Amino acid sequence: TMSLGVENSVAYSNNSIAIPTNFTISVTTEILPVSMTKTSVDCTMYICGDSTECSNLLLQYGSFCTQLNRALTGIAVEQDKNTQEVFAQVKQIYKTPPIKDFGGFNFSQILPDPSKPSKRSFIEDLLFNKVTFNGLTVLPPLLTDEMIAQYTSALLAGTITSGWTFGAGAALQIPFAMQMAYRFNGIGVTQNVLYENQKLIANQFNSAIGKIQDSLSSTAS
Amino acid sequence: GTGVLTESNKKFLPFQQFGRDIADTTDAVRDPQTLEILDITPCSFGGVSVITPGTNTSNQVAVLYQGVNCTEVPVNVFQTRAGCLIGAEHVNNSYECDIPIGAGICASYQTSQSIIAYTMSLGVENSVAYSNNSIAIPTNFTISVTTEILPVSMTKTSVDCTMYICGD
Amino acid sequence: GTGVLTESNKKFLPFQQFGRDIADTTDAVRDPQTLEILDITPCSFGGVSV
Amino acid sequence: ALGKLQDVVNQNAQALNTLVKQLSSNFGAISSVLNDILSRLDPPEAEVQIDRLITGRLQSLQTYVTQQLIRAAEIRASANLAATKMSECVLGQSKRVDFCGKGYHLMSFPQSAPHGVVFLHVTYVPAQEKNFTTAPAICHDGKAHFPREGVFVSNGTHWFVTQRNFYEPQIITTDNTFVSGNCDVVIGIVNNTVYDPLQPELDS
Amino acid sequence: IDRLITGRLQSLQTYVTQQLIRAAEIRASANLAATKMSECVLGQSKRVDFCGKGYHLMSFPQSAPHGVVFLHVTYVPAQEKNFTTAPAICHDGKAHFPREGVFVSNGTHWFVTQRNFYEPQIITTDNTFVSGNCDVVIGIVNNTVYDP
Ligand SMILES: *[C@@H]1O[C@H](CO)[C@@H](O[C@@H]2O[C@H](CO)[C@@H](O)[C@H](O)[C@H]2NC(C)=O)[C@H](O)[C@H]1NC(C)=O
Ligand SMILES: *[C@@H]1O[C@H](CO)[C@@H](O[C@@H]2O[C@H](CO)[C@@H](O)[C@H](O)[C@H]2NC(C)=O)[C@H](O)[C@H]1NC(C)=O
Ligand SMILES: *[C@@H]1O[C@H](CO)[C@@H](O[C@@H]2O[C@H](CO)[C@@H](O)[C@H](O)[C@H]2NC(C)=O)[C@H](O)[C@H]1NC(C)=O
Ligand SMILES: *[C@@H]1O[C@H](CO)[C@@H](O[C@@H]2O[C@H](CO)[C@@H](O)[C@H](O)[C@H]2NC(C)=O)[C@H](O)[C@H]1NC(C)=O
Ligand SMILES: *[C@@H]1O[C@H](CO)[C@@H](O[C@@H]2O[C@H](CO)[C@@H](O)[C@H](O)[C@H]2NC(C)=O)[C@H](O)[C@H]1NC(C)=O
Ligand SMILES: *[C@@H]1O[C@H](CO)[C@@H](O[C@@H]2O[C@H](CO)[C@@H](O)[C@H](O)[C@H]2NC(C)=O)[C@H](O)[C@H]1NC(C)=O
Ligand SMILES: *[C@@H]1O[C@H](CO)[C@@H](O[C@@H]2O[C@H](CO)[C@@H](O)[C@H](O)[C@H]2NC(C)=O)[C@H](O)[C@H]1NC(C)=O
Ligand SMILES: *[C@@H]1O[C@H](CO)[C@@H](O)[C@H](O)[C@H]1NC(C)=O
Ligand SMILES: *[C@@H]1O[C@H](CO)[C@@H](O)[C@H](O)[C@H]1NC(C)=O
Ligand SMILES: *[C@@H]1O[C@H](CO)[C@@H](O)[C@H](O)[C@H]1NC(C)=O
Ligand SMILES: *[C@@H]1O[C@H](CO)[C@@H](O)[C@H](O)[C@H]1NC(C)=O
Ligand SMILES: *[C@@H]1O[C@H](CO)[C@@H](O)[C@H](O)[C@H]1NC(C)=O
Ligand SMILES: *[C@@H]1O[C@H](CO)[C@@H](O)[C@H](O)[C@H]1NC(C)=O
Ligand SMILES: *[C@@H]1O[C@H](CO)[C@@H](O)[C@H](O)[C@H]1NC(C)=O
Ligand SMILES: *[C@@H]1O[C@H](CO)[C@@H](O)[C@H](O)[C@H]1NC(C)=O
Ligand SMILES: *[C@@H]1O[C@H](CO)[C@@H](O)[C@H](O)[C@H]1NC(C)=O
């Protein structure tokens, strides 16, 4: 009989409060399917492949072919719309400056890699590597892997160099240290914490990124 | 069968006469007279779409044969990963996507005017002037009233199954 | 067919007999004896709820 | 713009048309009209073709009902989204980003439409950006000062503490800033006078 | 051929229906991913566990074959210490409540600290606001509020 978790009585008393004296900057991963392969099926070729008599017999079934083809075409257009909605949320393709001074934070593992022929980040390369004709045709996506990589790179550059501002309108530059100070103010922790523990936070963030790299590289589940 | 027979590198065993795949369709064969292996490829086929600017704008159209090499078409020919596009003038300049053909290629009717297919542009590049001691603050605002249209309900249709199938 | 025949204002051409629609169902007819156009309406029917 | 609604309409209409057109198909029967088959064949012979007609029409009905269920699920998802926006964009102010339109959300107004709703999202979009030199904190008496609400900016020579979403520079006073720690820890911290309102009052 | 066509059309219809349902599921996931991009990446989310377990600091997108991977950077408190807490404090017969924070005690002295991190501070009239007398609040304690 499976256990639901370790029993843990909270030491509750009407005048006892536990306050945290430290923190960890945990980088977790969440994978979301966005689109499915665009496939179109030729009704006549599949059902009556190269047969005039079969095609004539199939003609009597009314508008089955048109409705099946319309359904598949709608699904394919839906896939294109899904990708466009998810990724094309940035009006202008921002790019990070050549000088990488982000307050000690190290984004080299997620910023685009010029070395690879495709401008794709290191962790993006890991993700791509880990994931793997009878009237059925597999249409290609409108946005190639290169274009989706460009969109994600634009999103990352905008985020890093401008905080949340680029989502509201014109992207406003801002030091990433001050951006993180604002992020801390958002969660109810004063900003002086970030300034006073900037090096510690940067080290924790870099270690978390490394752990993400290792987890993606090792476990494919 | 019907297909394209080509010279094959497959190492058929002496006793084997055919080669199948996951679909169980004949993927390879052995010539009965001369014992040489031949790969069978499906005869080229694919959808035919029509990139057309609004007829109100122009009657000139381009034809896309999806996923077919530009060699099997009878007869201003562009070979993109989406397929063979005939009637579109390839342009190196990149603009926003107008009529998405696919594989990053979009075709638009533009300047005499013709249909030009191009690698669609992902908006305008904009290098943020980032530095560790520079913040851009907005000195003004604009109250933008946008619109968001959402379907809420659809037609309430009932069908008299008996009457429809067996009317009177 | 089954339905209600009503006097119609449709301008049938001399050689045209029936009048169809997107449903591809006979909406109008020409009375073969007296050359007049009659609209055909399906006999009234509908769900009966309580 | 209204396509989202118009599209929907067409879809439904299209389906009905298709359904009706399926009444004019043979499905393998001698004719597409039951009355013709009944009048031209005896029941023992007619039933054979009527079976094909009935099976075809029933299959068409099942296809229509299945696709209608799928489309109704899609419309139910969109209607739940519309109810969420009515609750959060209209009946309140949504702090969620891009949920009630691009830019900071001020308010929203509902407007009916044929088989749909339309939200006019009034949002606030900053327009005119000005560069400034910014510092995370400020040192006055060795104590690092951080802004309570706002950010330290400089027009080149003087330091002001301005709210983040609208450039409204203000003198840097102890009311605007709070101290935490000394100035040997922060990176990018700077020196500047932090005006004290109480000093002149005590002077006089 | 009648039987073959009927069977193959049934197979095609089954395939297309399964595809429609699977595509509806994928579109639900795509809408969720667009929401996460809008609210976690393009902004900081207050919604709990929406952008990772913890207090969301930021998110980073990464394309993957037919999907998006969000790296959610979150703030998780680590080492917690017990303290004795008083809802208010009485200095001159008027209850004092913390403007933004909580009252804690390390055994003898009383501090007012932000709620999600231990940064104790000497209680002063700037850290606290007064409301009413000292005969209503339950659990209130006695202490001095430093006056600058
Ligand atoms: C960011 O991290 C990467 C690796 O995670 C660092 O790249 C390493 O740089 C050192 C420099 O001495 C080399 O010896 C290593 O071989 C590099 N590793 C890899 C995988 O390239 C990079 O230096 C870090 N950037 C910052 C600013 O700390
Ligand atoms: C908060 O926790 C972090 C660890 O998450 C502490 O940082 C570590 O400190 C030890 C010794 O103090 C070092 O050996 C480690 O290398 C540090 N790790 C990192 C990532 O910097 C930190 O000291 C703790 N701070 C407090 C106030 O408890
Ligand atoms: C902020 O922008 C608004 C426009 O969005 C400015 O108002 C305009 O000012 C010019 C010149 O004074 C007028 O010609 C326009 O008619 C004004 N527009 C409107 C809608 O009234 C405003 O002056 C700007 N303010 C600042 C401080 O830059
Ligand atoms: C930065 O702003 C300050 C404050 O507005 C400017 O100082 C004032 O400048 C005006 C003229 O623009 C004078 O009339 C005031 O007497 C100045 N006051 C003080 C306290 O200096 C300063 O000139 C601005 N500097 C720049 C480079 O824009
Ligand atoms: C800000 O002011 C402090 C003191 O007012 C400066 O500290 C001086 O630093 C120099 C060089 O490090 C030392 O020689 C002095 O002895 C320091 N003074 C004191 C009183 O300790 C500090 O350098 C200034 N910072 C900036 C950026 O101007
Ligand atoms: C609770 O905190 C107070 C203040 O932080 C501590 O009081 C200090 O105790 C040390 C003992 O070495 C003295 O040197 C300081 O002068 C005291 N400061 C003040 C302002 O009185 C107190 O010791 C702490 N007690 C516990 C149990 O944590
Ligand atoms: C806080 O202080 C007040 C007064 O300094 C205490 O109230 C006194 O309580 C005693 C015993 O209950 C009475 O004899 C006095 O008459 C009270 N005086 C006043 C002015 O109220 C109160 O009990 C203290 N609270 C705690 C928790 O110790
Ligand atoms: C039959 O084909 C084989 C294959 O090479 C050949 O060697 C042989 O001479 C042929 N015989 C005749 C009678 O054609
Ligand atoms: C053709 O399109 C233009 C704009 O695209 C429009 O102004 C014009 O009225 C249209 N013509 C017709 C006949 O619809
Ligand atoms: C089309 O065929 C030619 C020659 O057979 C080949 O070089 C070319 O790569 C083919 N096109 C594609 C897209 O594979
Ligand atoms: C486009 O540019 C490439 C190299 O940049 C060149 O080889 C090609 O001929 C150009 N095409 C046209 C139509 O000018
Ligand atoms: C037949 O019908 C026409 C229609 O009006 C009529 O004119 C004619 O007299 C009819 N003939 C006979 C024999 O009743
Ligand atoms: C800030 O300065 C940089 C310096 O290169 C400039 O490119 C940028 O346009 C400036 N910001 C604005 C809003 O003009
Ligand atoms: C910014 O970076 C430059 C070098 O890139 C350095 O000299 C300067 O001290 C830094 N200043 C701040 C406030 O980070
Ligand atoms: C707080 O008190 C409870 C009471 O048993 C104890 O279990 C817990 O360990 C204490 N907190 C810490 C951080 O030790
Ligand atoms: C907390 O509970 C204890 C029971 O041990 C009680 O004596 C005390 O008065 C309670 N405190 C408050 C503020 O109710």
Swiss-Prot record, chain B:
<feature type="glycosylation site" description="N-linked (GlcNAc...) (complex) asparagine; by host">
    <location>
        <position position="92"/>
    </location>
</feature>
<protein>
    <recommendedName>
        <fullName>Spike glycoprotein</fullName>
    </recommendedName>
</protein>
<feature type="glycosylation site" description="O-linked (GlcNAc...) threonine; by host GALNT1">
    <location>
        <position position="111"/>
    </location>
</feature>
<feature type="glycosylation site" description="N-linked (GlcNAc...) (hybrid) asparagine; by host">
    <location>
        <position position="140"/>
    </location>
</feature>
<feature type="glycosylation site" description="N-linked (GlcNAc...) (complex) asparagine; by host">
    <location>
        <position position="69"/>
    </location>
</feature>
<feature type="disulfide bond">
    <location>
        <begin position="97"/>
        <end position="106"/>
    </location>
</feature>
<feature type="disulfide bond">
    <location>
        <begin position="70"/>
        <end position="84"/>
    </location>
</feature>
<comment type="similarity">
    <text>Belongs to the betacoronaviruses spike protein family.</text>
</comment>
<feature type="glycosylation site" description="N-linked (GlcNAc...) (high mannose) asparagine; by host">
    <location>
        <position position="132"/>
    </location>
</feature>
<feature type="glycosylation site" description="N-linked (GlcNAc...) (hybrid) asparagine; by host">
    <location>
        <position position="56"/>
    </location>
</feature>
